[PDB]
Amino acid sequence: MRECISIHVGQAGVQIGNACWELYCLEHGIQPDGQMPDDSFNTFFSETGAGKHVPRAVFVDLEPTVIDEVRTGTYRQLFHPEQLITGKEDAANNYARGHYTIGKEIIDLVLDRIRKLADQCTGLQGFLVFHSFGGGTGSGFTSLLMERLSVDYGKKSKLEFSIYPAPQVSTAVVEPYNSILTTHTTLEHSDCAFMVDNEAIYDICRRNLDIERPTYTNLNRLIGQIVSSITASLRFDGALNVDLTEFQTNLVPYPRIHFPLATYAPVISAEKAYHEQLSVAEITNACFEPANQMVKCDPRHGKYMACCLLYRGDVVPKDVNAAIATIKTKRTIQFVDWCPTGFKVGINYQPPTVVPGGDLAKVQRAVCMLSNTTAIAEAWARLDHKFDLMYAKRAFVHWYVGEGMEEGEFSEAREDMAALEKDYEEVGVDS
Amino acid sequence: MRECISIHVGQAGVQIGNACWELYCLEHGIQPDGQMPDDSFNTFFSETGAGKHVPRAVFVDLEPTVIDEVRTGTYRQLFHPEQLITGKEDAANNYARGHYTIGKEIIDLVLDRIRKLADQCTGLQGFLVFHSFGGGTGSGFTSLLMERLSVDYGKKSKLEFSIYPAPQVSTAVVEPYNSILTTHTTLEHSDCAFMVDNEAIYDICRRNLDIERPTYTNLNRLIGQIVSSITASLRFDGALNVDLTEFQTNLVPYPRIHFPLATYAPVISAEKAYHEQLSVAEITNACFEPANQMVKCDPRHGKYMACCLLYRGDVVPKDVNAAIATIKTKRTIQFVDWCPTGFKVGINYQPPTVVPGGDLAKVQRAVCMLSNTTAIAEAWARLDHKFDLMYAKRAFVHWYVGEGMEEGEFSEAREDMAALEKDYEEVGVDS
Amino acid sequence: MREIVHLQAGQCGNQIGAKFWEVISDEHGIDPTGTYHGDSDLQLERINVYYNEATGGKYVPRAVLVDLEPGTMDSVRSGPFGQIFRPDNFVFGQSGAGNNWAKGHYTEGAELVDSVLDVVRKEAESCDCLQGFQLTHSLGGGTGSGMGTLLISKIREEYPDRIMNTFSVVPSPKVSDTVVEPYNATLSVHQLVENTDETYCIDNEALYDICFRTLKLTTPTYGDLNHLVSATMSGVTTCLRFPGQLNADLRKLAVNMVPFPRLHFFMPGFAPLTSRGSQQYRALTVPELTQQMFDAKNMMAACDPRHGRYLTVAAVFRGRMSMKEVDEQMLNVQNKNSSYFVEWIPNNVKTAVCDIPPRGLKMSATFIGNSTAIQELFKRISEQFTAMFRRKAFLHWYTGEGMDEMEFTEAESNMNDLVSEYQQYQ
Amino acid sequence: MREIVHLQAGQCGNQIGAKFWEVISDEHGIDPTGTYHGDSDLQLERINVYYNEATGGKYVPRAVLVDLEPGTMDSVRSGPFGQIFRPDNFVFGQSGAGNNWAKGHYTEGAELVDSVLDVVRKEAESCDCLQGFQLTHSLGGGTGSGMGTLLISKIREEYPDRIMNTFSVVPSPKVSDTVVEPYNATLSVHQLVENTDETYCIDNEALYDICFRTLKLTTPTYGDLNHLVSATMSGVTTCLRFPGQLNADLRKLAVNMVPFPRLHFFMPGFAPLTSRGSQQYRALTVPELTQQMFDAKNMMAACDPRHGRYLTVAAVFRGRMSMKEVDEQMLNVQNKNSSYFVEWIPNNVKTAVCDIPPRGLKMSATFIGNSTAIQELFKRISEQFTAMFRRKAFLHWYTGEGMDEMEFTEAESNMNDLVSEYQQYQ
Amino acid sequence: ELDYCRLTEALVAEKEKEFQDYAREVIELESETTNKYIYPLVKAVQEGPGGGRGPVFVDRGGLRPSYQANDVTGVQLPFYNSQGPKYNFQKSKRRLGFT
Numbered sequence A, B: 001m002r003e004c005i006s007i008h009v010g011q012a013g014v015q016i017g018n019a020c021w022e023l024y025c026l027e028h029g030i031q032p033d034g035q036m037p038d039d040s041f042n043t044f045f046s047e048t049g050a051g052k053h054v055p056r057a058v059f060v061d062l063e064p065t066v067i068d069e070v071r072t073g074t075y076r077q078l079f080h081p082e083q084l085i086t087g088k089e090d091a092a093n094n095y096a097r098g099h100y101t102i103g104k105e106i107i108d109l110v111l112d113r114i115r116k117l118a119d120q121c122t123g124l125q126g127f128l129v130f131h132s133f134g135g136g137t138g139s140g141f142t143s144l145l146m147e148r149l150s151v152d153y154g155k156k157s158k159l160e161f162s163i164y165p166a167p168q169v170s171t172a173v174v175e176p177y178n179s180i181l182t183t184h185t186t187l188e189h190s191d192c193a194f195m196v197d198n199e200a201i202y203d204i205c206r207r208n209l210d211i212e213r214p215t216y217t218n219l220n221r222l223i224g225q226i227v228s229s230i231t232a233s234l235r236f237d238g239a240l241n242v243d244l245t246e247f248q249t250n251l252v253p254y255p256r257i258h259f260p261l262a263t264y265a266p267v268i269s270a271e272k273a274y275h276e277q278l279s280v281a282e283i284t285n286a287c288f289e290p291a292n293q294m295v296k297c298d299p300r301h302g303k304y305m306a307c308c309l310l311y312r313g314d315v316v317p318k319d320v321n322a323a324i325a326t327i328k329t330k331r332t333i334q335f336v337d338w339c340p341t342g343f344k345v346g347i348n349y350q351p352p353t354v355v356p357g358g359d360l361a362k363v364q365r366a367v368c369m370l371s372n373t374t375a376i377a378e379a380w381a382r383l384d385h386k387f388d389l390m391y392a393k394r395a396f397v398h399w400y401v402g403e404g405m406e407e408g409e410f411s412e413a414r415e416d417m418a419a420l421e422k423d424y425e426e427v428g429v430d431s
Numbered sequence C, D: 001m002r003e004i005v006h007l008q009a010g011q012c013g014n015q016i017g018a019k020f021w022e023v024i025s026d027e028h029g030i031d032p033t034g035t036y037h038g039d040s041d042l043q044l045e046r047i048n049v050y051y052n053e054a055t056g057g058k059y060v061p062r063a064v065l066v067d068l069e070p071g072t073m074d075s076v077r078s079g080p081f082g083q084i085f086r087p088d089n090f091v092f093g094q095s096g097a098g099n100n101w102a103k104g105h106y107t108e109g110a111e112l113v114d115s116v117l118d119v120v121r122k123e124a125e126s127c128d129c130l131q132g133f134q135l136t137h138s139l140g141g142g143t144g145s146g147m148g149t150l151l152i153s154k155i156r157e158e159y160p161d162r163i164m165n166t167f168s169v170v171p172s173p174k175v176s177d178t179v180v181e182p183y184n185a186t187l188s189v190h191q192l193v194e195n196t197d198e199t200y201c202i203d204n205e206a207l208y209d210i211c212f213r214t215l216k217l218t219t220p221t222y223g224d225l226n227h228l229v230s231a232t233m234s235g236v237t238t239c240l241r242f243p244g245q246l247n248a249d250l251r252k253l254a255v256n257m258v259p260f261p262r263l264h265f266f267m268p269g270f271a272p273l274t275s276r277g278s279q280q281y282r283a284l285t286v287p288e289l290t291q292q293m294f295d296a297k298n299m300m301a302a303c304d305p306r307h308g309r310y311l312t313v314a315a316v317f318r319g320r321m322s323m324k325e326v327d328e329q330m331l332n333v334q335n336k337n338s339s340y341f342v343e344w345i346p347n348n349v350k351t352a353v354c355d356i357p358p359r360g361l362k363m364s365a366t367f368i369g370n371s372t373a374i375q376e377l378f379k380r381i382s383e384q385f386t387a388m389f390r391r392k393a394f395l396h397w398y399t400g401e402g403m404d405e406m407e408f409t410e411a412e413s414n415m416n417d418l419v420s421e422y423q424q425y426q
Numbered sequence E: 001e002l003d004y005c006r007l008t009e010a011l012v013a014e015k016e017k018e019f020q021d022y023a024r025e026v027i028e029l030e031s032e033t034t035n036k037y038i039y040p041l042v043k044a045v046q047e048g049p050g051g052g053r054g055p056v057f058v059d060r061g062g063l064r065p066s067y068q069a070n071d072v073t074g075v076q077l078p079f080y081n082s083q084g085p086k087y088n089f090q091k092s093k094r095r096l097g098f099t
C-alpha cells in the first residue's frame, strides 16, 4: 500500500541510485533480471502479471555517458527503459543554463513519467530526490523540478537528499555560484532536505572503514545504508514503527528550518568487528562524536533543536532509554531550553543487510541519527563568505546573465541567504 | 563490576605492559587469540557477545619502533587496534618537547580513547599508570596526562608505578632535568606513587634468582608480580579483602606524603625452591631486609611511617599474627612515636601463577609489602645534589627554553622540591 | 446481562487489546479457533459480558480495533488470537495522523468518526442492557488520542447516562520518546475531564520500574508490559462475570470513588507479583499481599502518595479468602499511617471479594487509589507544554489544519484550574 | 511470640551471622533447602522468634544482610546455607568505606541507611509482639562501625521501647590489623554509650587464646572463630525458644545487669571447651561447668577481672540438671573469692536453668559479667587515639568528608568521662 | 496445600524440560557442518534460569535467584570459585569440641 517514488537527478544521482538499487534487490531477494528464484517489495517495486518487478525510479540526467552505463551493465533488464531520461546537451556546470535554456526541453518528459508512476500508486507516502549542489542540472533542473511538483501536488512529501559543497575540497570553480541560487528553491519548495558533504565522508572512510584508496562507490554504499535504515520501518515490522511523515513533522521547529544532519553508527570493518562488541549504548554514543559526524560542522559549537533516531536489529527498548539518560547527564552536549524533550525513537527487528563486495560487516545493532543543530550556521557563513569573495570583483557573471537570467537575481540570493542565517541566530538565544 | 584501566606510556610503558598483560592472560587462562578454551576476568577484560576478552589498556608512545613489535608478535590478535596509540616524532629525552610542543598533538587522540573505555565501565575502581622519568613521553606527555584526567575525572583513583633514575648508573644525561620537572605534577596530581629504579632490581636477580645476564624481560616480570598482588584482592576471593580505596587510606597520612616503597618476597630460583622452606614467617622477614629492598635506600636510616601487607596462597592468620609479633619486638625495626599500630593485612587464596620463561619457581605462599618510610628522602637528596651540580654551569639549558617553556620553571621545580624534603624530615621528629 | 463494548484506539490500543483478549480467553477456556473447551460450568455461566453467540458453538469478542496505519492492524489479524475477531470491526484509515492531535481531531479523524459510529451503534443495540464501554489508548500519539477524544465526545452526547471507562497512558518525563509529546497530552486532557466517567493513569516509566526491580525481566519487551496492564483490567471487572461473597461491579466501584465529577483520574497497582526466585520464600496470605498493594514501588504511575493525601481508596480482592482479615489489615493501615489519609472522609476504602482465582494462583488483589499526589504528573506536563509554547513550537503543524491559536490558551487555563483545584482538597 | 529481628553489618558481620544462622538451623532441625527434618515436637513449638513462615511449609530467617561492598556478599551466597536466605534482604552498595569511620557515618553510608530501614520495617510491622533487635558489627572496619552506628542511632528514635543487643568487635592490642583502627573504635563508643541497651565485647585475641591454650587446634580459621561467637549467641537467647524449669529471656538478663544506663559493657564466656584428647578424662557435672566458667582463660574479651571488681554477674544454663548444685556451687564462689565482688550489692548473680541442651551435648553454661576491669579495654584504645591525634594523624581522611574537628574533641572527652565513671564504682 | 505446592513445582519443571528439549534439537540441527559458531548458543542454554551467576540449587529445581540492589544501577553480584577446602559441619563440630 505505502510506496514512494525515487528521482535520481544528475550524474551523482545515477551513481547513488545504482548503489541503492543494488542494495534493495539483495534486501528483497530479487535477481538482476527482476524475477525471484509477502508485500515487502511493494513500497518500491511494482508487480506485473509475469512475475517481474519494475523499480519506481526516474533517472534525470543531461549527459548520455552516465545513462548508457546503466543500459549496458547487469541491471539492463531491470529498469523500464522509459524511466531513464537523457537530455540532448549538458548544461556543463551552469545553474542558469539548466534553469532557462536547457531544462525546459525535457521538463515535459519528466512530469509525464511522474504522472504514470503516481497513477499506479494507490496511496503515495512521499517522494525522494537525489542530487548534488555542485553540478549544473543536479542543482539547476532540481530547482525547477520542485516548482512543478509543489504547484501540481499540494501536500505530498518530497524529501531532498543533497550533497553540500565541501569547504576545502571541490571539483569546480562555479560551485559556490550554483549552491547559493538553489537556496531560493529549497527554502520555498522542500518539505525536508538533508545534506552530507564529501569532505566529512572522506575522513570517516580513512580512519573507520580502514580503506587507503576509496572511490565514490565506497561512499555511495554508505549513503545507501542511510536511506535503507530510513525506509525499513515502511518495509518491515517494528516494535516502534515510524513513518515518513512522522519524523518529518517532529524535527522541524519552523517551516524555514528543515535541514537535519545525518550520521550512522557503527561504521567498522569486518576485522574490527571481530574485536569490539556493538551494543545499544555503544552505538548511541558514537553518533554524538564530532569526528564521526558526516557534516563538517561541530555541534559542540551549536545547540540541538530535536533528535530522530532509527534503530535496527536486536534492540530492546530498555537499553534505548538507558543510553538516553547517560547522554543528558554529560554537560559537553547541550539542548535548547525551549525543547526539553527533543528525542524520537524507532526500532526495527531486521538487522541491516550487507552487499557482496562491500566494505562493512554485518551488524546486529545499528543506529542512524537525524539531529537538527544550530551548527549548520557554521558551514553556511563560510560558503556565504566565499560566494561573496568571488562575486566582489564580479566574476563569471557573463555566462549566467547572457543565458536569460537578469543580474539582479544574484542579489536576490544574497538577502534570502542573509535572512536565513539570521533566523538560525534567533534560535540559539536562551529566554 | 569494579575494574582498572591500565595506562602505559613510554617505551618503558609498552615493554612493561607487554609483560604485565602476559601475566594476566595465563592467570585467567586466556589464549593469545583472546578466547578461553567466573567473573574474575571482568576487572581487566571486556566481554564481546561473541566471547572475546579485549583488554582495557591504553598503550601510549611517541615512537613507532616499539609499538609495531606488539602488532607483529604473538599477541597481535589479542590487542584491539585503536588501543595502541603512536605519534610521529618522539620527544627525544626532553621534558620541553613532550610537554609544550610535541606532546600536545596526541593529547586529544589518547583521551578520546579513555572515553570509550570509561563509558563502558559501569563502575571504575581507578586508573593504573606506568611511566619512566628517563624518557621524553614518560616525562613530558605524562605531565600533561595527569593534569587533564584531574580535570576530566575528579575523584578517581590514579595509582602510579614510576621508574626513577638509578643513583649511579643511568641511560641518559638530561635525565635529572626530566626527573625534577615532573615532581610538581606527581605532587598535586598523583594519589599514590611507587617508584622503582633498575639498579636495585638488577642486584636482586644476580644473587636471588641466579641469573648471570638479565635483560629487561627478566626485570619486567618482577614488576608484573607487584601489580598482580596489589589487584589480586580485587579479582579473587579472600579471607579478608583489601581494595585500592583501603591501602590508600592506611598508608597515606598526609596529602604531601604519598610515596611508598614497594617490595616483594620471596624471589628465589627453582634450585633454591627445593631447599629453603617457605612459611609465612620466613617470607615476612624478607621484606624488612635491606638486600631485598627494591629502592636504593635503607629504612634503617629512616622511620617506618606505615605498612601494608598482601598475602597469597595457603596462608593462615595464625602464622601472620605470630610473625607480626616477632618483628615488632626487635629494635632494628623502628616505628614513629605517633603510629603505635601501623599495619594493614590482606589475604588471598590462589597462589601466584608461574609463566613460561619466568626464572622463578612455582610457589605456594608469597607476600608484597608497601612500607612508607622517611628514608625515601635519602634518594631524593642525592639527585638534587646532582641536579644543582648539573645546573651549576647552566648546561643543557638551551634545549628546553626554546621549545615553549621558560627558564623560570627551572628555579620553580627545584624550590618546589626543596620544601618537600623539609616536610618529609619534620615528620620524623618526635614530640 | 450487564454488557461492556470494548473500544481500542490506535496502535497502542491494538497491541493492548491483543494481549487483553489473550489472557481472558484462557480465563474462560477458549481455543484459538474460538470454541469452548471448559472444565467448570461457571466459566460459561457468564460469558455474554464480553462475548457474542455464534453458530456452531463459537464465541466472538464485542470489540472494535480503531487505528489509522494498516501496518499494525495486520499484526493483530496474523497474531495468535487474532482469528477470533469479526472482520467488520477492523476500522482503519488510509493515512497516518502524523503524531498530531489536530490531524486526528480536525483533518482526518472527522471522516473516520462516521465509520466507527456506524459500527458501534449496530453492536450496542445487540445486548440486553448496555452497562457501559471501555477505551484503551495512549496520549503519546495522535492516532489513539486524536480521534479518541473526538469519538468519546460524540458518543457521550448520544449515550448520556452510561459508564465510560478509559485506559490512559499519560506521557512520562524520563521515558519520553516524542518531541511533540506534551502538545498531544495537554490539549487532549481537556476532553478527558469533561466527557469521561472514569480514567486510569498508566505510566510506561512506572512499568519499567516494576519489571526491572520486582518481576526479574532481563529483556522486558512490550509484551510483558502489556501482560501487566491487561491483568489490571481483568481484576477490576471480575465481579461482572463471577459470583463472590462480597462483590462490587464497575458501577458500584465508580460512584464511591468519585467525590466530584471532575476528579476521575486514578492510579492502578497490582499486588501478587513475584520473581522466579522469590516465589518460594513469599507466602500467599492476606497480610502479605496488602503490604505490596500499598507499596509505593508497585504503583502503575510515576507519582508518590507520600507527598500527597489519599482521598479515596479501593481494593478488589480475589480467591477464597476470610473476610475478617481483609478488614482488620485495612483498618490497621488507616490508623497507623494517619498522616497521608484525609480526615474529612472516614472509612475511605472500598472492598470486593471474588471466589475463583486466576489460573496458576490461589489469591490475588487489585489496588485502585485516588489521591492529591496525581498533581505531580499534571504540573510536570504543564510546565513542558508552557515552555515550548512560549516560542510557539510546532505551531504550523496545528494552526494551518483548521484550528486557531487560542485553543491552546484555554487548554492551559483549564489545565491550571485542575491543578489548583487539587490543592484546595489538600 | 516474643520475636527478635537479626541485624548483620559488614564483612565481619556477614561472616559472624553466616555461621550463626546455621547453628540455629541445626538447633531447630532445618535442611539447607528450608524444610523441617526434626525428631521431637519441642523443636517446632517455638520457632517464630527467629524464623518466618513461607509457602509450602518452609521457614526463612528474619535477618537482613548489610554491606557497602559486594566482595563478601558472594561468599554468603556460595556457603553451606546460602540458599536459605531470601534475596530481598541482601542489602549492598557500590562504593565502600575503605576502613574509614567517616565514610560510613556521613557520606557513603547515609544512602544505604534509608534503603535498609525500609526493609527492616517490612519484617517488623508484620509480627505480633517484638521483643527487640540484635546487631553484629565490628569496630575494626568501615561499614560495620561507620554506618553500623547509624543504624543504632536511628532505630532508637523509631522504636524507643524495645531491646537492642549487640556483639561489638572492638580492636585488640596485639592482633591490631588496621592502621586507623582506633579512629573507628573511639568515635563509635560514644554512639554505643548512649543508644545501646546491652553490649558484648568480642575480641579475636580472646578467640585465639581460647583456641590455642584450651582447644588445641593447629589451624584456627574464622570458621572456628565464628562458631565460638555463635555458641555464645545461641546460648544467651535460649529460654525464649525452649521451655525450662527456671526460664529467663534476654530482657530479664538486661534488667539485672545494668544498675545505671551507661554501665552496659559485658564479658562473654562458654562452659565446655575441651580438646579431643582431654574429652574422655572429664565428666559433665554441674561443678565442672562453673569451675571452667569463671576461669580467666575462657573469657571472650581481652581483660582480666582480677584487676577490677565483678560489678554484676550472670549465669545461663542448658541441660537436665538440679537446683541445689546450681545454687550451692555459686554461693561458694561468691563467698571464697569475696575480695573481687563488690560490697554494696549482695546477691550479685542472677541464675537461670533451661531444659533442652545443645545438640551433641548434655550440659553447658554461659556468662555475662559487668565489671570495672573492662575499663582496661577503653584506656588502651583512648591512649592510642590521643597518641595519633596529638600529631594530627590521617586527619584529611576524616575532616574533608564533612565533619569538623570538634567531633574528635567531644568523642575522646566523653570516653574519658565514661572511664572516670567506672573508677568511682571500684 | 502441600499437594498444590508440589503440583506447581512439577509443572514449572516440565515447562523447563520442554525448553531444554527444543534448544538441544536446535543446537544439534545447527552443528551439522561445523561447531565454530555454536558458542553463543551454548552460552544461551547455559545461562541458567533467571539472572543468576552463582551455582544452581539442585534440590530446588535448578533455581538461580538474583541480587540486584545497587541504587539505580542494580548490578548483579559476580561469581568466584574458592580454592579453600569444603568443610563438613559435623566434622567442624567434633573438631571444635561440641560432640
Ligand SMILES: Nc1nc2c(ncn2[C@@H]2O[C@H](COP(=O)(O)OP(=O)(O)OP(=O)(O)O)[C@@H](O)[C@H]2O)c(=O)[nH]1
Pocket: A009, A010, A011, A012, A015, A016, A062, A063, A090, A091, A092, A093, A094, A132, A133, A134, A135, A136, A137, A138, A139, A163, A165, A170, A171, A172, A175, A197, A198, A216, A219, A220
Ligand atoms: N557525495 C557524492 N557527491 C558526488 C558524487 N558524484 C558527484 N558528486 C558531486 O557532484 C558535483 C558535480 O556534479 P556532477 O557529478 O557532474 O553531476 P551533475 O550534478 O548532474 O552536474 P552535470 O554533470 O554538469 O549535469 C561534484 O561537486 C560532487 O560534489 C558522489 O558519488 N557522491
Ligand SMILES: Nc1nc2c(ncn2[C@@H]2O[C@H](COP(=O)(O)OP(=O)(O)OP(=O)(O)O)[C@@H](O)[C@H]2O)c(=O)[nH]1
Pocket: B009, B010, B011, B012, B013, B015, B016, B061, B062, B063, B090, B091, B092, B093, B094, B132, B133, B134, B135, B136, B137, B138, B139, B163, B171, B172, B196, B197, B198, B216, B217, B219, B220
Ligand atoms: N624499570 C624499567 N625501566 C625501563 C625499562 N625499559 C625502559 N625503561 C626506561 O626508559 C627510559 C628511556 O625512555 P624510553 O621509555 O625508552 O622512551 P620514552 O619514555 O617514550 O621517551 P622518548 O625516548 O623521548 O620517546 C630509561 O630511563 C629507562 O629507565 C624497563 O624495562 N624497566
Ligand SMILES: Nc1nc2c(ncn2[C@@H]2O[C@H](COP(=O)(O)OP(=O)(O)O)[C@@H](O)[C@H]2O)c(=O)[nH]1
Pocket: C009, C010, C011, C012, C013, C015, C016, C099, C138, C140, C141, C142, C143, C144, C145, C169, C176, C177, C178, C204, C222, C225, C226
Ligand atoms: N504501555 C504501552 N505503551 C506503548 C506501547 N507502544 C507504544 N507505547 C507508547 O506510546 C507512545 C507512542 O504511541 P503511538 O504508537 O504513536 O500510538 P498511536 O498514535 O495511537 O498509534 C510512545 O511514547 C510509547 O512509549 C505499548 O505496547 N504499551
Ligand SMILES: Nc1nc2c(ncn2[C@@H]2O[C@H](COP(=O)(O)OP(=O)(O)O)[C@@H](O)[C@H]2O)c(=O)[nH]1
Pocket: B240, B241, D009, D010, D011, D012, D013, D015, D016, D099, D138, D140, D141, D142, D143, D144, D145, D169, D177, D178, D202, D204, D222, D225, D226, D229
Ligand atoms: N570475630 C570475627 N572477626 C572478624 C571476622 N571477619 C573479619 N573480622 C575482623 O574484622 C577486621 C576486618 O573487618 P572488615 O572487613 O574491615 O569489616 P567491615 O568494614 O565492616 O566490612 C579484621 O581485623 C578481622 O580480624 C569474623 O568473621 N569474625
Ligand SMILES: [Mg+2]
Pocket: A009, A010, A011, A060, A061, A062, A063, A135, A136, A137, A138
Ligand atoms: Mg545533469
